[PDB]
Amino acid sequence: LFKLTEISAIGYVVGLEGERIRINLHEGLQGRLASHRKGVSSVTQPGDLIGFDAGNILVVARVTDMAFVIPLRQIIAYAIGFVKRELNGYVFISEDWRLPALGSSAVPLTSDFLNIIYSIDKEELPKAVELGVDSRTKTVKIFASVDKLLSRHLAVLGSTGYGKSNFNALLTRKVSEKYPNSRIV
Amino acid sequence: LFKLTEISAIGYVVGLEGERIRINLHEGLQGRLASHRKGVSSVTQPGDLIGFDAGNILVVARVTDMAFVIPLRQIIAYAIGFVKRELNGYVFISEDWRLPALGSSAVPLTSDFLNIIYSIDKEELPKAVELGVDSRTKTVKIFASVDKLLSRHLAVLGSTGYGKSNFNALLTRKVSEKYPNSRIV
Amino acid sequence: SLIVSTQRPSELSPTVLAMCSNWFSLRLTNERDLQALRYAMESGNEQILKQISGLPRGDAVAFGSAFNLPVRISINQARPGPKSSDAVFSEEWANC
Amino acid sequence: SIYQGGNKLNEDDFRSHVYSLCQLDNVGVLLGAGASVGCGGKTMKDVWKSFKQNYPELLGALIDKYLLVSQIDSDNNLVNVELLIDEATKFLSVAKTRRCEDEEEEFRKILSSLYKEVTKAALLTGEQFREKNQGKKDAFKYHKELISKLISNRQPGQSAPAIFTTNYDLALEWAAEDLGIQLFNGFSGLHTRQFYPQNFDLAFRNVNAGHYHAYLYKLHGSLTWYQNDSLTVNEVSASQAYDEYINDIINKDDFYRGQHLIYPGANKYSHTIGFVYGEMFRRFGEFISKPQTALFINGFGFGDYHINRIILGALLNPSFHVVIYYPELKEAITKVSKGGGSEAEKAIVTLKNMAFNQVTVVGGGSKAYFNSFVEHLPYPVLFPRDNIVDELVEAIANLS
Amino acid sequence: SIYQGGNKLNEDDFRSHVYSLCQLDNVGVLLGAGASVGCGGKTMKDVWKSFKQNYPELLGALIDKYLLVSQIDSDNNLVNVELLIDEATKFLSVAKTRRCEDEEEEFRKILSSLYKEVTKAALLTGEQFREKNQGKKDAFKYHKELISKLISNRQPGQSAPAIFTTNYDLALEWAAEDLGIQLFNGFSGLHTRQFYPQNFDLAFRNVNHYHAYLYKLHGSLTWYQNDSLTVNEVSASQAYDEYINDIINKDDFYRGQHLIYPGANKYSHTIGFVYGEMFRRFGEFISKPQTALFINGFGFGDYHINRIILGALLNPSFHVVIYYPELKEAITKVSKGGGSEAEKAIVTLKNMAFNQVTVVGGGSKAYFNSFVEHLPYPVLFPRDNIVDELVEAIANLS
Ligand SMILES: NC(=O)c1ccc[n+]([C@H]2O[C@H](COP(=O)([O-])OP(=O)(O)OC[C@H]3O[C@@H](n4cnc5c(N)ncnc54)[C@H](O)[C@H]3O)[C@H](O)[C@H]2O)c1
């Protein structure tokens, strides 16, 4: 009928030591793809992002290891932050001093929650210009506030033949089309 | 009579410790040398290339270590890129953010797959300049592009009595013949 | 405010590079060129520095006060852009 | 108006504090008689007003002869109805034992009116009490939210939430039945339900490895509990109770079943009726005495003595935190300053003026009602705020 | 053309999405009557169209006297076959048990004509239904590719593909026998073949990738009931020798319980066993987590299939893909007002605000031939077929 979580649980925490987290999976997953109401996501490859259901907050972790214990599969991850709701939206706090408890579920992160992580304030959106998309998924759009970029000095580095003049032209031309009354030499 | 894989297997993935790939060899001495329809290949010394089957891609790796654990045997390797089909053939890419999943199989690479690793982008044939063959196997022919080799400066180094003048003479004469309207001093 | 572009970050003062609050770092392959970025800030950021060796052509890594968390970005292609290239030898040598 | 030991603080601090307390080992909620007004219920003062307006003749004889009810309180409307039926039943029992035939004809007619009036304010739906699927109406919209919010924020390895109550109404059960969650009240069986005092220690687990359960305690009985010709307690459905005795009470003008009912705390002198209230009080006292309890109170008028004594005695604990709702702070303080208010006012004002950060009292009149209390609780991040299930069912029902 | 939750998709996103669903834990395919039209089969409308002109005098009785089929549906060609077959069988049973010889003789001609018409389209090669090596021909070249694609795309240690069908033709077995792949239909034995429901729990092993599960929901031409109360299966040649050649070339319908197709005679205590087992297996298969299913060639005229499919989407991990050619006309007819219930169902499922439903339309881009190419090959899959040269060299030297 009605389940507490709208996203299908994958594994369960079996052991904890503090700084790192250990996870085992159910025996019915071999294809490294987990499905939800939105689409399909990858969970097992190193460098990806996963989450756990703990109380009224959501914790975000990163996959680093895939080592053998039908055998069992083990995953080691570390925490980077948590997601909270206050009035009608979502805020991402950048502290990881809280850890989940034993037996908690590990869940993937959909495209909706991935947009929130790489986002800024709503009122600063009208005065922002796009830069590009994420490389792992090619679906998220990254914005930047000109108020904070052009306050201190900005450093651009890169080797010969890998697209720095293109970035310079794209960044400089957009501001000119945005604020007619500005000086750049 | 129905055969899914016409190339023999060697081992399977047991560990993924970050950027490292761990492989266990199969029973018998078949993991030392393998034979297929085209010829005889081997994986016995650090610095060779092996492939992992992952469906639409073929991850290419280079081996570094080999040791005992008749006991169990292990191989560690690192990744380079992957190979995929485009229209009716194959295309090589040199991006190494991709890793295979646990439980796959490793197969030796035939001469038909070393050629695509060291080829050009299907359009620079008219300005192709021949240099030599690869040293490890002596089966792949190396070419170069006039518009990109002798466009900027170039460096030829080495000690005394080891063949600098031979390379100079070969390159100069081969460049002279392709277009009879070139100036060299 | 200034914008600094170079391919040899080692040829800059420790003071001039440390004034920046942002660092857009593209592909870099040299041992002596990678110490400046690490030394610009104290520890707590190591996972984002190991990727820089094997980045592809077009993408970039950006971190600073303009980002809540470091982001790996795929930059667009502006149209029209700068000049394509300088003179090419084959066409001039083969005009006849 | 939120008060913490004689100070003042705004809403943001209160919300942060509530969120902090909503992640402790033990959580309890206490609801009184004022929380059922959003469905069509009535408060005891309204019941007394209706009684003294509908039956005037018996009021005169209830003062001069027996001197059980004071003259002053009847005008001020501070009459404890729950403690009148006990004295009336005691009088009737002693008169019947002495075999005084003429005395019964009055005490057997004053109890019929009281039970006629008391019942009518507890149906909560009037005539539509015997029907089916009464939890899908818009009246009970908040109780489902309260139950879901309390249930869906417990980490693995933590106790299921416990709900205490005082009303003898059928609102929480109706609300919980629609969600599909089973509540524990101690009764077992279908064709013959009996009370098992040791049944409050069971949970649900999956044979392969859902976990949707919550306890419920009633401290003043319920409309559907009765004692048969034997000595045992039984439970039936709303339709069965309406067919058996509720209709007879509500319509027939010369009907009095006797000591067949169980509400509200009526015949506590019988030794087969107090066995329920004893366990209720035992479990309440055992729960609030736990090391890391976090409690909520709402709708409770503090008209009793033992509950207040138990709460105050439990307050001398270094790790007990309480939150109290009382929408009469200022009007009570005005009376307290001059000469002091009634007993409830004195009790609440003497509790509030304690110099502790554990106790917290909230004022603001209509801002401290049940409706506002409902959404003050946190909300899960993964909880779906979308319309999916209710639309697929409609699509399925359209197929024909 | 392509819709998923109200938006529109392009070709590359559709291809990438299709590839990702083929790597799921559970895969499944449902092929309808349309899949056989590419090799000799006929649509349900064509059967009634042919029967109207072949046997005209019997059409009046079915409407004027007995009142089984109405008028407007016959004019528009929206009449079933199985339901009227079942009703005719029930009527004949009542007439026989009531001793009414006047009406009993009438239904034999009707049932014989209907079964002859069904059989004359069920066959896929005509007179060569009894010869050998029918999978060596060219018309069955796409079922082979479907089987190979759905088998080769499974990681070692995973499950096996499951195939569901609603036909009673012999194309799939004929294709599977040529490759060297064994399909488990539930029967066992050679001289006496019998149905055991527990045979669907079997698998192979090597003592020192081969097998798939085929569920038929309308029986076959090679299933019949003998005098003993156990169903039996024979080869196509034996069926042609025994009870297939007679219906086509002769006028004889004395076997009111022998045949098992299609979806009829459900009032018997032996025939309903097979239908119940197949339907229960199909219904309980798609309740598993991490599942994917494709639908092709199946018009949505079945109420129970539609009901269970719509009710299965309530799970968070159920994904479906539908191929429906006549899509725009359905929208035009339902906006103005018209169409049958199937168009209503497809429209009311297309507009859903879900990401788990995909509908593909067109005129020839949604046919069975194009469904195969959307499924990929592995990079290591051999294709340079040279063993045939060795085979012919071996055969030539004798
Ligand atoms: N000795 C016993 O066993 C015994 C006997 C009788 C009563 N009781 C208990 O039950 C009593 C409760 O009944 P009461 O009639 O005294 O008043 P109450 O405590 O139920 O309600 C307090 C006040 O809240 C007002 N209110 C209206 N709507 C509200 C809302 N949505 N949220 C909050 N408050 C709202 C009520 O009108 C007013 O009574 C006392 O709490 C307590 O004495 C115990």
Ligand SMILES: NC(=O)c1ccc[n+]([C@H]2O[C@H](COP(=O)([O-])OP(=O)(O)OC[C@H]3O[C@@H](n4cnc5c(N)ncnc54)[C@H](O)[C@H]3O)[C@H](O)[C@H]2O)c1
């Ligand atoms: N024995 C019975 O119970 C009985 C009787 C009559 C109909 N039916 C069936 O009719 C409906 C199911 O549809 P069906 O498939 O069984 O027959 P059907 O004739 O209803 O559907 C076939 C569909 O496929 C389309 N199509 C034609 N050629 C195609 C091609 N090359 N590629 C792809 N699609 C093509 C046709 O336009 C359309 O008719 C009911 O759901 C089902 O019961 C069953």
Ligand SMILES: Nc1ncnc2c1ncn2[C@@H]1O[C@H](COP(=O)(O)OP(=O)(O)O)[C@@H](O)[C@H]1O
């Ligand atoms: N993000 C990008 N997307 C597409 N093409 C790019 C991108 N970055 C660089 N290029 C291409 O790379 C080539 C060389 O880049 P260029 O800007 O000249 O490098 P540099 O400035 O370091 O010399 C050009 O064809 C340019 O368009």
Ligand SMILES: Nc1ncnc2c1ncn2[C@@H]1O[C@H](COP(=O)(O)OP(=O)(O)O)[C@@H](O)[C@H]1O
């Ligand atoms: N690629 C080669 N294969 C075979 N012999 C070579 C090759 N390169 C150089 N040599 C040998 O090296 C000699 C030339 O050396 P040279 O280049 O004159 O020495 P130095 O580097 O001091 O000028 C020749 O005799 C030639 O046989």
Ligand SMILES: [Mg+2]
């Ligand atoms: Mg430039």
Ligand SMILES: [Mg+2]
């Ligand atoms: Mg020299």
